[PDB]
Design a protein around this ligand. Structure first.
Ligand SMILES: *[C@@H]1O[C@H](CO)[C@@H](O[C@@H]2O[C@H](CO)[C@@H](O[C@@H]3O[C@H](CO)[C@@H](O)[C@H](O)[C@@H]3O)[C@H](O)[C@H]2NC(C)=O)[C@H](O)[C@H]1NC(C)=O
Ligand SMILES: *[C@@H]1O[C@H](CO)[C@@H](O[C@@H]2O[C@H](CO)[C@@H](O[C@@H]3O[C@H](CO)[C@@H](O)[C@H](O)[C@@H]3O)[C@H](O)[C@H]2NC(C)=O)[C@H](O)[C@H]1NC(C)=O
Ligand SMILES: *[C@@H]1O[C@H](CO)[C@@H](O[C@@H]2O[C@H](CO)[C@@H](O[C@@H]3O[C@H](CO)[C@@H](O)[C@H](O)[C@@H]3O)[C@H](O)[C@H]2NC(C)=O)[C@H](O)[C@H]1NC(C)=O
Ligand SMILES: *[C@@H]1O[C@H](CO)[C@@H](O[C@@H]2O[C@H](CO)[C@@H](O[C@@H]3O[C@H](CO)[C@@H](O)[C@H](O)[C@@H]3O)[C@H](O)[C@H]2NC(C)=O)[C@H](O)[C@H]1NC(C)=O
Ligand SMILES: *[C@@H]1O[C@H](CO)[C@@H](O[C@@H]2O[C@H](CO)[C@@H](O[C@@H]3O[C@H](CO)[C@@H](O)[C@H](O)[C@@H]3O)[C@H](O)[C@H]2NC(C)=O)[C@H](O)[C@H]1NC(C)=O
Lengths: 346, 346, 346, 346, 346
């Protein structure tokens, strides 16, 4: 019995009229190529460039009546990547590649096996940096949706159709974890058939639903932002005579809030719409700014006040100081309730 | 009937006298190659390097009488990229490439179809990082103009001419959005015929009109810059006796403005001309600096003042403090009006 | 006697029925390829991307009865990399490559020698940037575990099996030092046999146990963080009359702690769980914040106090100031003991 | 008449004894290759790495008697880059490449035309990142000199000589602008013949004279640095009784100057020699530091002063305060004159 | 006479029994390849990654009796890089490459000349980014030692030996300058013969002795660090009554020192051992911290003091203030002497 390598010479060579530039079922129905990808290393989701690097295994299955054999006993011939370049392959590509490369560490990472009926399996390893438009209207409580479409370039709809398989469409690794986001078990599968001036091409896309973990931003940009507001609340228990103490407290705490507000947009795009973290840095900046105007009103009334007028303005400048100890801890409290509840049902 | 792959062997091979190193219509009129590009992924417009990464589909159409066939029934032969390297192709390149590469994810992204009359369509996917000179005289209210020219390298004007098609010259994707800029529907199409020491070559360019969204810079560099000026206005309601309070307020607020003025040029080139944001950081720095000189004049008059001279300087040092509460909120207001109106018609 | 180069022509050529696309022992037992790697340049372990660049020498040994010779006297034929591409090689790859390349400086860094019995040695140089999931629950006192698996891509378990050799499995260079971590002499060797929808493949992995050196973080984020707490302890020896002195001391030292707490996450991922350095920056921030509330209580009691009530509140506002000089230096001391002991046995 | 493509087969092929590995005029005079470059995209001049990226068109002209034809009517044959690799080309390279690549966007950007007398034109597009040693003794008022040399590698002086053409040696694009530097119209052309242990090789270099635009650094590091000195001058109009006001003014303004002095070396190499901007940040730091020692002398004399000694020290502590209002605004003024004049003739 | 190109066909072709896969002097003594490198562009020595980019010319000389000719008159045949790939070349590589590439700007930068006796010169251009372990025990006064070893990969000691030439081993360019380090004229040449599990290979290395220039760090991290200590010395000339002045001076100057101490490790690895700059930032931080405790002791004694006890504590609180004006300027002076002398002989 001749080995499978010499058997491919009589099937892939110039004999039998088999050419690698002809699609199967020519002058007939289009080729239905089913695909299923396996995610190996997901993560590294940048926000300034709005892209994410993923390493998937692209599997392609299509029927080819020209490769059907009957003399070989087994129904699986794991060939060599050398014969892989001498056959026909679908022109599958991604519309959001933005730079990609293969992996040829000691061997071109390609798979090729042919069944008796003509089934051809084609599995390779591709590293992609896919771009996805993100909506940052509520940045700390956003639901990301990273999509990836698989289009055709040379073959139109009447010559090649891409579809998803029924069982096991998108497999996920067991020990695949993410530091910031989380990968939900629900993945939508829809069509993305485009229409250009040349024609229409097939397209299959998968929608990965992600969600950020608030455990990181809560400690960096929320807990320190909440303590600065408390630093302005303590400015009311000090007597009005200590002018350099209360003025310096109302200024040193209002400028460090602007620094944290300006520094909270380091790893963020320059979007125009306001997000959920910008209003938090803005409203909390208003409370520490209102504390400055609070003492300014108390100081102006105290310095404006023979014995009948001064006996009432002192009681007025002190009464407003007692209300401020209950007003701001309650106005900021009702805002803290209306903030997390509004961003919990949207 | 022989397949189209074997038919190309009798048309692209050594037979019929067809060579891939000869342009169509040799020793006659030049080749008129019409082009139309489709934008897939636009964005990532850097400002320090003054470049932007774009992913376009370069389509080229040219007539070739040597490829006219009459035996094949259909008028479209979607060939393989293997035969694409055995024919003649225009030497189209960009004068502002600055690094570029193709996309060969599982298939070389090339398109080739030949009609009966000799029409040859050539569509590929090219990722370009194009450089464009930007005028930042008014950075927050600028109108960017990103151009891209398509020149010839080996064929002069009398051998190859590039032109734009009539219908559908520059197609834009439907879901193409930008975080900072906006892509207008008006795209100019002009010629850029260059003249070197070797000769003259064809050139076609498209002018993309962009515009920044002020919604981002208004919240980061304008709202905090406006609140610092208010921190200097509150220094007038405090009595002149509180020297460590008003001095510290006039210094802690004037130095944080310089930090924001120096930190507002992070993602900006080192241009010499002054922009619209530099004068805003400069004039607002003058207001918070004038508040320091305002108290310095009040403190100097108060410390200079038997009972006839001291009874008038106290009334003078207090009258100037009452005018400053109306002067600066009005001088800064008329400047705020003359600022946004001047940069709204230019 | 013919040279070994011409002898390979009669062994690797079309004669003798030897093809490079057939694995040894075909239609029989699988090939048992033993591997052992040598680490040349280890280090550069990034934390934001969670990867590390390593340069190893991949040695592969497998038997091949088709290469057994008997005419050559010696038992070692150091061939040329040209003949290396004309033989069969295992399809070894890594599941966490994330970009890799070879080294061809003046010569393709490949090794190939064939023994008389059929032993084939294959040594090459590969530069890998391997990703590893890290658990940062206790960042300054963590025990890293960098793993690297060697899987098969085209050959299943019944066709190719990877195993580790007995003596000298993972060799380490003599002068291999690390600036941050340390490489322990204990390296675990286990199996990682995966199961996909196509089939099962062999897998061998090595677990490198690393450990950070606390000598760096102790000086940057611990010693300065401990001195700031002492700056708040000195606020008790100052009299209560100095309001601008004690207030400014309690605010200038509590805001610089937040800056160090926010700046301590520069080269750190955005993980949600709290680490050992976040609680240190949080508890120490509570001590410098409690010093602010300490003086606020003393100032409020002093300003609230004919001669019977004022004679007791002054003694009360001074007694609490004497307890604070012993309380905080002891509450922070017992926390400093419970901190390093808890992170010394876990 | 045979086409020019088939005519090259009888001239570039094995016939006529023409080989691509033999230089013209063998066993005789050396080849005189004249070169002229065209600058397309200049700029991106980094300062930390001391390099600049340039995109030039390298044109090469040399005579070759083996390519002289007499049957073709025209005197220009624009060939294909395929025949370009089958002829002899000079081994021109740059001694300061530091990474380079070609441009093959849809066509290898190469030019090849042969005249009747034997003139061969060779124009290509090369992107170079050239390194140049810069002298930063006066950084804001420096005159940069970026050089680029074209050496030979395999052919010595007696086999190949590089020279510049007479008319149009270095052409510059019309719309070529720079954000920081300026390209002068004077470009020196000299020789750089090197002598190694192997032999001597030809070399041609061009000296591009650049000059920075002070309009950028004047607004960022000079105007804010001048206002801080004024903040220390206002410390003299305040009474000596305001100790927390004048001390805080002399310290908050002297520490922000050190921050600007340390932050003014971000995009700068770590050179040892002092530059023109370091002395400006040093002398201006001395003025704001002398203001601290000025009040320290006034405060020490005021606190040292039955009625005869105190009546003179108060007049002395006030007289020195009046001289400081004229001394420092004049000592800093004469330094400001001696600074810009010294760096205007050197 | 036949040209040298056609003469190589009778020497490098299949005739004469010359094969490119056989080393010279087979079945005999090993090949002694002498090497000498020329440094073109040295510098760019990173500290975080601990590597440096160098551009050297790798020259290799070895005897080959199979290339000896007698018919050609001259003794030098400068061949083409095409024939360079058809001969035998040593398998020279570097053990610390970490990414490398060649230079093929318009020509593969290779040199090949063969003498009559059989001497073969091989010169190429290689760009290397070499890693070197650095000892930063005394960072500002360190003596760097960058090494680079040239090992063999396929040929053992008994088949190929690398050695350095006698005259002109390591040539240095004339205009080669460095911004930070300096290249000494003393370069050690030793052997680095390694022993692996496969065998022993030749190795030659050169030790480049470097030294940093203190002129940069003296102005950025030493002069500003020395002025901050003077800001704490001036806190003694102010009266003890000015509590908000001396407290604010002792805190604003002690926190900016921590910022400079934390910011002095930007371009530095995360090593555990303490360096010479860390102790300078630590001891100087102790002086500005001792000034805070100095006033705390004076303030506590002043606030503790019918007329007999208060008449002595005031004289005691003032006497300690006079000693502090001589103590700290002398304790810091003797430390400044013991610092530069200790790091001048080690
Ligand atoms: C690839 O999949 C498509 C469907 O997604 C297959 O096409 C449809 O194929 C049928 C033949 O099986 C075509 O004929 C029709 O048959 C149905 C009964 O199955 C009958 O009810 C209809 O009236 C019609 O006669 C049908 O036109 C075709 N439709 C389309 C839109 O293509 C296709 O055959 C598959 N290709 C291969 C190679 O299997
Ligand atoms: C490519 O397009 C150019 C025009 O952009 C074509 O060229 C012009 O072509 C005409 C022939 O169609 C040349 O002849 C002239 O004909 C006109 C009538 O159409 C007549 O009024 C003139 O007096 C003249 O006889 C004309 O010289 C030529 N002009 C130029 C500037 O090239 C060209 O033919 C097109 N090429 C192909 C292959 O179609
Ligand atoms: C590669 O290694 C495997 C083991 O890891 C070898 O396989 C085992 O090989 C034996 C033959 O040596 C097979 O037969 C059995 O022999 C044992 C005695 O050694 C006997 O007790 C059993 O009842 C059985 O008859 C055995 O089935 C096989 N097992 C597996 C799981 O593969 C294999 O032969 C090695 N390959 C080469 C080419 O050396
Ligand atoms: C390339 O250019 C060089 C000059 O840069 C040419 O070389 C010089 O060429 C002349 C022949 O033209 C050699 O001969 C001499 O002729 C002059 C009159 O022109 C005569 O006064 C001298 O006494 C001598 O007989 C001369 O030796 C040579 N000099 C050098 C330094 O090379 C060269 O011919 C040019 N190559 C080609 C291929 O055109
Ligand atoms: C490459 O260099 C080595 C030395 O580094 C050469 O090897 C030594 O070569 C000599 C022959 O010249 C061998 O023989 C001996 O000769 C000496 C007199 O020179 C004699 O005193 C000894 O008793 C012995 O007979 C010697 O064994 C050998 N040693 C080693 C360690 O290799 C070698 O010949 C050079 N290769 C070529 C191709 O020139």
């Amino acid at each position: 019995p001749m080995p499978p390598s010499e058997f491919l010479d009589k099937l892939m060579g110039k004999v039998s009229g088999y050419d690698a530039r002809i699609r199967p079922n020519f002058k007939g129905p289009p080729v239905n190529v089913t695909c299923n990808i396996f995610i190996n290393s997901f993560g590294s989701i940048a926000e300034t460039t709005m892209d994410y690097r993923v390493n998937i295994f692209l599997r392609q299955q299509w029927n080819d009546p020209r490769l059907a054999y009957s003399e070989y006993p087994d129904d699986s011939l794991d060939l060599d990547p050398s014969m892989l370049d001498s056959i026909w392959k679908p022109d599958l590509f991604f519309a959001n590649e933005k730079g990609a490369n293969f992996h040829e560490v000691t061997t071109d990472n390609k798979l090729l096996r042919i069944s008796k009926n003509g089934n051809v399996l084609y599995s390779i390893r591709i590293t992609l940096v896919l771009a996805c438009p993100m909506d940052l209207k509520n940045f700390p409580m956003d639901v990301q949706t990273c999509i990836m479409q698989l289009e055709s370039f040379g073959y139109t709809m009447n010559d090649l159709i891409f579809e998803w398989d029924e069982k096991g469409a998108v497999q996920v690794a067991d020990g695949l974890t993410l530091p910031q986001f989380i990968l939900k078990e629900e993945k939508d599968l829809r069509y993305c058939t485009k229409h250009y001036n040349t024609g229409k091409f097939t397209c299959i896309e998968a929608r990965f639903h992600l969600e950020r973990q608030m455990g990181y931003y809560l400690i960096q940009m929320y807990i320190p932002s909440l303590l600065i507001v408390i630093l302005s609340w303590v400015s009311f228990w000090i007597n009005m005579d200590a002018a350099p103490a209360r003025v310096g407290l109302g200024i040193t705490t209002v400028l460090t809030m602007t620094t944290q507000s300006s520094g909270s947009r380091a790893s963020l795009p320059k979007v125009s719409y306001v997000k959920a973290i910008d209003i938090w840095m803005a409203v909390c900046l208003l409370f520490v700014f209102s504390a400055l105007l609070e003492y300014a009103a108390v100081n102006f009334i105290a310095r404006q006040h023979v014995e009948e007028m001064r006996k009432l303005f002192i009681s007025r400048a002190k009464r407003i100081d007692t209300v401020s100890r209950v007003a701001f801890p309650l106005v900021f409290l009702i805002f803290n309730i209306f903030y997390w509840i509004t961003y919990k049902i949207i």
